[PDB]
Amino acid sequence: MKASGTLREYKVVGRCLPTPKCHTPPLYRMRIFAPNHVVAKSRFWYFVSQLKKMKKSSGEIVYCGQVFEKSPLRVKNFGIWLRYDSRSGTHNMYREYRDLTTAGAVTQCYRDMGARHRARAHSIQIMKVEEIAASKCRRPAVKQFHDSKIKFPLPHRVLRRQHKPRFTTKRPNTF
Amino acid sequence: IEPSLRQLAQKYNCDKMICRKCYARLHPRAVNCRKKKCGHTNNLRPKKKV
């Protein structure tokens, strides 16, 4: 996967083809975070083939739909579970974020595993994601915004260079 | 001699730590050499008494 732009959650269910040995296979469900519905039904077969004896030639997906959030306008706390590969070994890792939506917190994770651990988007697996509440958070970068009557200014503001005249007689005050 | 003044001058001259790598003269409760030449190492030994 490349994990391009903002990601997008998918509910991908699927079953393996009916054999003479097992009519009606149990048809498992997954929760795929992917850029579009072609990579999502590809990564469905990456994880299902790790757990069951299913593979895309002996299976079919029966539904791949975008599941989106039930409260886009509510500030939530997302603690997620990772299984990235490093240069020496591989590691399990709990890692909190904070976003309006479910699918944008896992976008913020790939941007952050690549930043802090150089972990590319293929060598990283998402175990599970849920909204957690306050007093169950561990990370103080997330915890410090749990503040009724939170306030801070914006010191040393800088933006809009060369869009203004590139040569002026006016030193730009940074507030 | 002046044994109180003996211990006062020994505060600046003997009661210190010596690094085995950067050979510094640090302070008697160091854990690290402060010099970048040894990469702030953590193998120290006290200054050798008379």
Partner: protein, 191 residues
């Protein structure tokens, strides 16, 4: 982490009145006046409250090694309250074997002229940072006293004597010779 702000406050007694030009801190007290400029340190200084005169230094956002620098502001500020109301006094004694260390003062406290340091013919004229002055002590042997308002001008000048009386080419585990500081106190006491 880039934390939301930290702040220390400085309780200021009434006999000292602090004004600020910005990140400059002007400290006026009984025994003079002294100032510092903190225009390199990227913080705001707000002196709040009538009748009580609290000084709150707070740094918004900031990284962890710029969280370590808000405490350094308030510690230099307290040493300006202390130095302008009580002064600083570093008492240094002369530790010597067989050769006595002769010490005089040439010019008004601003020059200390050390000679006979371990039998040497070469004099050691140590000039001091302006604002401090010397005194040969009384009722104690071989002692020198340094008094002034700024702790960085007392203590750096105290280090110029202790560095000048340095034994070369010899063992410094024996040959304990020099004029080392003995005490870190104030000029006026018990306040």
């Amino acid at each position: 982490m880039k934390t939301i702000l930290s702040n220390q406050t400085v309780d200021i007694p009434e006999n000292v009145d602090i004004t600020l030009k910005g990140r400059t801190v002007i400290v006026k007290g009984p025994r003079g006046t002294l100032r510092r400029d903190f225009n390199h340190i990227n913080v705001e200084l707000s002196l709040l409250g009538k009748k009580k005169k609290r000084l709150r230094v707070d740094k918004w956002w900031g990284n962890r090694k710029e969280l370590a620098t808000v405490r350094t502001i308030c510690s230099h500020v307290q040493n300006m309250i202390k130095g302008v109301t009580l002064g600083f006094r570093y008492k240094m004694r002369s530790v010597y074997a067989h050769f006595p260390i002769n010490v005089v003062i040439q010019e008004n406290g601003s020059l200390v002229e050390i000679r006979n340091f371990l039998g040497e013919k070469y004099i050691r004229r140590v000039r001091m940072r302006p604002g401090v002055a010397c005194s040969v002590s009384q009722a104690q042997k071989d002692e020198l006293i340094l008094e002034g308002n700024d702790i960085e001008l007392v203590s750096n000048s105290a280090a110029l004597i202790q560095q000048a009386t340095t034994v070369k080419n010899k063992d410094i585990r024996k040959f304990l010779d020099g004029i080392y500081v003995s005490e870190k106190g104030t000029v006026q006491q018990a306040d």
